Amino acid sequence: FRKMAFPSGKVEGCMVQVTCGTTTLNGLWLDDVVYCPRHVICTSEDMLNPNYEDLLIRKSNHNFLVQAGNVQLRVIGHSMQNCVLKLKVDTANPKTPKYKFVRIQPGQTFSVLACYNGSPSGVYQCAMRPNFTIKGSFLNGSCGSVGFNIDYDCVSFCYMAHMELPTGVHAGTDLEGNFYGPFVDRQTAQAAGTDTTITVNVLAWLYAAVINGDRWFLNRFTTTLNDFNLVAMKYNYEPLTQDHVDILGPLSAQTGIAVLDMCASLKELLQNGMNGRTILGSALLEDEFTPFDVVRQCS
Amino acid sequence: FRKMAFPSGKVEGCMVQVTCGTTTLNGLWLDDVVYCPRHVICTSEDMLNPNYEDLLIRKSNHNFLVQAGNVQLRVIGHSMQNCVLKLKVDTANPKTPKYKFVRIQPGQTFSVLACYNGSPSGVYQCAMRPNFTIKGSFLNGSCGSVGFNIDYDCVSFCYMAHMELPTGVHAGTDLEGNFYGPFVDRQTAQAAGTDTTITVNVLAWLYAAVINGDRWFLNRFTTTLNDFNLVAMKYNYEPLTQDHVDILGPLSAQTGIAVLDMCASLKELLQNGMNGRTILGSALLEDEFTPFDVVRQCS
């Protein structure tokens, strides 16, 4: 069962390079505006306790060097929205796709175009962790890399990277400058809170194994939502809500397995173990597939 | 450690839909030639024992309908090279990237752009298994999907999918129509030989773990190349050759751990087992990262 990313062509046409002084990172060019992290007006000695509000007023438009491949963009205005910087240019991007800005919830999935230079270099599929961090790549320079979903022909941008934490994860904001989680863009000691497994996603991954003919883990028993969550808290699983149960309705119909029946299966795997056998080629339970992802891939 | 695919934009601009009678599948439009699997001239009847030379002789150019998005292309010639059909059109692809055709060997990695319609739908990173099959998509219609690498703005095409095997994996050809492995484009009882773990890739993935500060699996022992292969084959691992020892030279230099010392580490995980700990976030040893891949993401 391949974890697949969305094709990145529509986003590749929007990536630019933004340089201010000695620091360079990636920006997003849509219409006649370039979006990038605001801490580009900072150096390393400036990152300690910077006042972006006071620092930005001393900048001038030509202080910003923007290159779209081998062409230079003329900056004609600057402004700031939360933790995102907005550079206005004199030319609208002819490769601009149909797009919109959205904010996702913990547990939802999206694709990330990692640009560790100023030109794209790789793409991968990931999930927003309950502690609001993203694992992703480990080679940097990708500050300003973007995350997105695609629905037919419309790109929904949901994430832009700002910082890399000590454990290899990074943290960021939506495209309107609002951070995900309790992080800030300062040079302070920051650390991610303890993480948790995404219960509804693990259940959706078990429906996909049954659709692919992997049925050894099913049993005859059922459980209550209360009895299950008591199990969930002991193994560091997110509690299951009635909202999550409804989302799984379609897969329960297609397979003929009641949602609380699959919870019985999951209950035994956690309590008892996987006994050497594997589900879809993996000895661990996968939690980076949403219910929606499973149906999209299983028609 | 993200398994990353290459950005797919340059390949997306080359995907077309090819229809012949009742059969439709994906094609590759480069310059004024479209490449696709030759079994697009077959029915469900002809796939048992088709005579392609006889089926192609009965066709004329107007028998082939080629659609590039919202535009139909005019076919002005047809030809066959091994198991690949070549359609000549009167219009060159304006989005043709710098490209070339190559043939890979088992163990190498590449990206797959899955188009289960005539339009792209997902991208993923994979490795050619020692038994010559690919762990690919599971919803069909993707026949004619393409696999590629990108190095310095040049697209290297290495794979096109032709058939779906009974275990869910796919088999295919290079871009010159020659199959990988002992497979043919007939719908006869075919099966892949037993698979094996790609030893040299696992060793490169263990060097990457040491680069990220994960050293718990190391020990103070060394081994001979023969004693290692004696243990390795017992777990269905590929034998290690002196050429594979050389390939790992750079990574051993960067870390300061001799290749045969790392083989000792792997020997211990295999003989004794992993049990409860996980290495790079996996309770299984990973084999879809080549030495080349490791150096490109760990500098």
Author numbering:
A (entry chain A), B (entry chain B): 3 to 301
The authors write:
The main protease (Mpro; also known as Nsp5) of SARS-CoV-2 is one such protein essential to SARS-CoV-2 replication. Mpro is an obligate homodimeric cysteine protease which functions to cleave the viral polyproteins into their individual functional components necessary for viral replication. The active site is located at the interface between Domain I and Domain II, where H41 in Domain I and C145 in Domain II make up the catalytic dyad. Mpro is an obligate dimer because the N-terminus (also called the N-terminal finger) of the second protomer closes the active site of the first protomer.
Interestingly, despite the breakage of the disulfide bond, the active-site loop was not repositioned as the F140 side chain remained flipped in the outward position. This suggests that the disulfide bond stabilizes this inactive state but is not sufficient for generating this conformation. The disulfide bond is thus a consequence of placing the two cysteine residues in proximity following the displacement of the active-site loop. Our work, therefore, indicates that the loss of the π-stacking interaction between F140 and H163 is the source of the inactive conformation of Mpro. And (4), the reduced mutant structure shows that the disulfide bond between C145 and C117 helps to stabilize the inactive conformation when F140 is in the outward position.
